[PDB]
Write a protein that binds this ligand. Structure first.
Ligand SMILES: Cn1cc(-c2ccn3ncc(-c4ccnc(CN)c4)c3n2)cn1
Ligand code: NA
Ligand code: NA
Ligand code: NI
Length: 328
């Protein structure tokens, strides 16, 4: 059965926790495990209390995310369809306990400095269950880097890396991310000049521009293996489709239009929609340290603009990667 919080989060680990992220699902912390940075996602399950606007999922309802996390993690070590463009999953635990005061301290700090949309997680009782997913530390999200990238050459690398990763997952797993907002794109420095992926047995390279991209957060994701589909059924969700103020919220509606509200089906066009949303963010909501005031860099900008205006005529990330001029 479940283990105590302290099994996953002994004092030293707890003392080094800093909150790095959140969602309706719960909370994400960074800490150190065996001298190694890790990210910990903590989800309340099986309880009756409202949490961040919603009822808690059951164990059965969080199993899809766990399975998808495992499958995408495996892609870094596969051969025919291989990418490091997701995030490694180190472990999963079911924990029982009230929320550790030291996590509440980290939570408070985050609320004080960035602000939170979540309820302070201080109302859980000592019998409360949680799922704790420990992930590889993937760096910092794209939104937080919105004024820090070197140039549009960097932006182009990011788009290429994202497209290739999604293509590899499409090919291997018929994967849709379904929620690839710019908080779910991580960037981490690398000294590698070229990154490698393999799609259906063919290996290719991408110039890194000094960054490795990781796609995270599989709460809404879908995939299948051997005819068994794993997904989040949002067909009766009202609020997911009623946001405004960001193109993000249009994507939810556009996905539902694409799939006729049948979330079990495979519609890799959803990956194209998210990549469109991300291309939009780069061109409109980001600022680079080197402006594109040289001919070479201005050509890159034009290519990203041309991508933005044509990519929605492609049927999948695989179609984009294999056929779009941006990646030739
Ligand atoms: C929901 N989820 C999140 C992760 C996950 C996994 C590994 N890392 N490594 C760094 C982050 C991170 C850093 C900064 N902002 C955010 C949130 N925008 C995340 C991270 N997040 C898994 N699932
Ligand atoms: Na929570
Ligand atoms: Na990665
Ligand atoms: Ni254990």
């Amino acid at each position: 059965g479940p283990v105590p919080f302290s099994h996953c989060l002994p004092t030293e680990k707890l003392q080094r926790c800093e909150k790095i992220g959140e969602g309706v699902f719960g909370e994400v912390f960074q800490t150190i495990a065996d001298h190694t940075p890790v990210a910990i996602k903590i989800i309340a399950i099986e309880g009756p209390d409202l949490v961040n606007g919603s009822h808690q999922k059951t164990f059965e309802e969080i199993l899809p995310e766990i399975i998808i996390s495992k499958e995408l993690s495996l892609l870094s070590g596969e051969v025919c369809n291989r990418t490091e463009g997701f995030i490694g999953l180190n472990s999963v635990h079911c924990v029982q306990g009230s929320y550790p005061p030291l996590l509440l301290k980290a939570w408070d700090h985050y609320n004080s400095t960035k602000g939170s949309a979540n309820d302070r997680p201080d109302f859980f009782k000592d019998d409360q269950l949680f799922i704790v997913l420990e992930f590889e530390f993937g760096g910092i999200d794209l939104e937080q880097m919105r004024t820090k990238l070197s140039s549009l050459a960097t932006a182009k690398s990011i788009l290429h890396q994202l497209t290739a990763s999604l293509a590899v997952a499409e090919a291997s797993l018929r994967f849709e991310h379904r929620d690839l907002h710019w908080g779910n794109v991580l960037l981490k420095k690398t000294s590698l000049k070229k990154l490698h992926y393999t799609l259906n047995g063919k290996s290719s390279t991408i110039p890194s521009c000094g960054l490795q991209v990781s796609i995270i957060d599989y709460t809404l994701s879908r995939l299948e293996r051997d005819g068994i589909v794993v997904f989040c059924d949002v067909s009766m969700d009202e609020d997911l489709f009623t946001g405004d103020g960001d193109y993000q919220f249009d994507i939810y509606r556009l996905m539902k239009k694409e799939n006729n509200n049948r979330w079990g089906e495979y519609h890799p066009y959803s990956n194209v929609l998210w990549l469109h949303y991300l291309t939009d963010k780069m061109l409109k909501q980001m600022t680079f340290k080197t402006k594109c005031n040289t001919p070479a860099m201005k050509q890159i900008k034009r290519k990203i603009q041309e991508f933005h205006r044509t990519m929605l005529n492609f049927s999948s990330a695989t179609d984009l990667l294999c056929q779009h001029s941006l990646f030739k």
